[PDB]
Amino acid sequence: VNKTILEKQSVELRDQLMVFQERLVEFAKKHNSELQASPEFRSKFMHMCSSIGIDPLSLFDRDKHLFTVNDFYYEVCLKVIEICRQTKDMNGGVISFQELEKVHFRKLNVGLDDLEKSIDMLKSLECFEIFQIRGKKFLRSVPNELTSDQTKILEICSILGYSSISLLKANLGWEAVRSKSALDEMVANGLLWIDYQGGAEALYWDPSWITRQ
């Protein structure tokens, strides 16, 4: 029977945490009841609960005060849906987080960290995938991911926004035909916009350029 050593921390630490949850919900319900309106203060406070190991969303449960903060996070989740339907023609099913942040939401006081969460909520409806490009996140509203080919193209469209048949041949070291064959695939599918005025070749543009500046 080994009592002394182990439980000296268990008992003690257990109460430290549990009783702290109360202290936590207090600062939130009392002071940061203006939290409902500050995209920064959220990301601060939420990065603590994460560190302890608490679903911050759960702290909000019991209070009237804190049940707006959820109601915001849902409000958003409900907008993200909507965004993705309106753009589905513009971008062909996929939108940069960039777009979401700066374009559609800057209008309603919502921040990248907030969004990110919303989207992790909608993992619940088994709906959109995420995918990164040259490291930047995107959001896939449509029902099938992009071939290895397709992704690279976008990687190339990161710098200029477009991609020639020649341009492919030159940077990634692609073929002539392999490129255009798999490059016209892309416009059937509404992802890329064509631009013929560009010269000898046509260039294939990525609706995302627009957004980032």
Next chain:
Amino acid sequence: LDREKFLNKELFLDEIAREIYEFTLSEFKDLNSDTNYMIITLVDLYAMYNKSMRIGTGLISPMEMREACERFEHLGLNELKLVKVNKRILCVTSEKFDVVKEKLVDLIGDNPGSDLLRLTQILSSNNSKSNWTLGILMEVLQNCVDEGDLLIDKQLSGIYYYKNSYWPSHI
């Protein structure tokens, strides 16, 4: 009516479910036929259910939308079921998938060569009450394409669908 008055999490959902089941059933059944259906991608459902019923009544976490619908079968709401059909399709329907698949297919077998923009209009009009929301359209389409149930014709102009009539793939 019902926001944060409910203490028991479970009972809440139990009643949220009842609400949706009734919402959706409301959004279609003409009761002049039992040839009428509803497929909805869950996401599209949550879009409207909330927007229409619960605005001001209390809003819903998708996590709770999913959990709600998952238990119709348990509360004896039998007309509508929630199911995952392949890897990807997660939706609520009044009928078997296969049965609704076949339906769409054969409509193309009447309206061949047609593409989404037209297939939207033709199949689901505004006041012509066949209840194909957009989301589920593309999702089904893409499905029958994989299992070989539907044939295609890609051009820049867009994608164009036809019915599989020269080729195999038994039910």
Next chain:
Amino acid sequence: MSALPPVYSFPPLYTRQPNSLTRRQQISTWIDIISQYCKTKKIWYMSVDGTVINSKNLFNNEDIQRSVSQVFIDEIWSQMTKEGKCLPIDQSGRRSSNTTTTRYFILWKSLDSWASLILQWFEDSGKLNQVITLYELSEGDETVNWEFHRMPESLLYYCLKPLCDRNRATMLKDENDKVIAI
């Protein structure tokens, strides 16, 4: 808020897009820029060339990259017409697809709605008994943050015309005139 809708400096906007879906948006985008440029600034009409003095051109003010095939620009206007807020003029507001539809016009408000707004000059100010002319409400004295000041000859005409459904406020006509009273 601007005449620099970011989307606008984007090259392939100016190429006629093959994806039947992408187009739906392409066109509706264009329309959105147009309307909100004549709205962003005082501008009222635009010629089918795409021309506009306040001189420069929408389908080619972005000549600082490229510009639009008129073949297409015509496809566009006709959607803008179909339901939109554009209408074909030459001098007088009417239309015959040749002579009388060279220049073009657009609002941000509706006709019904923009008519509804001098119902507000004269309903909230109670100037219903008066008789005033087009020449008098458009430049000089009726410039308030009411923006209709500078609504031209043939449009002020067109947009007062809806004041009549079955009831209205009156207007005058002759060989010599074109003026309105309430």
Next chain:
Amino acid sequence: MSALPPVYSFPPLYTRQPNSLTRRQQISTWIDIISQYCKTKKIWYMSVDGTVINSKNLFNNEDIQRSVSQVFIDEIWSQMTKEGKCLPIDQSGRRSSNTTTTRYFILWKSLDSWASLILQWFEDSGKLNQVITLYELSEGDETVNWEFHRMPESLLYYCLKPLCDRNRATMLKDENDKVIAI
């Protein structure tokens, strides 16, 4: 004209179908019209562009509509190479996936069934021990109720190579260019 099956006015024939199983089916059907075109017409070889002269292209010459990709055609070529009935060529029937395999060539009978029917010329007529060459049997005096007239320089060669490992009827060569006796 059997050569123009209804299946070929069908636009999806001209688009690499994604479904694994439904493709094998698609593939097998291209093979059947390529087979039939060349049997029902005089044609013997076909380029990998998919062109021919007796000048048409089977895949693109679909001008009443629109045509099809060459990233796919290879996939079709390869299945007809394996268990189908074609051999790649540049001039000589030999192959290197670059220089020596641009143009393609096809058979209705097999080479062991096609070599077995020119042996039924000289069984049925008794012109065995005589010596003729490719130039003689192909064009001129050997065109009868036998269709192997116009078998080009290199198929004759390789078509009648089952008979070196079969009965071993001798054949002759000037620095690798041929002529046969039986």
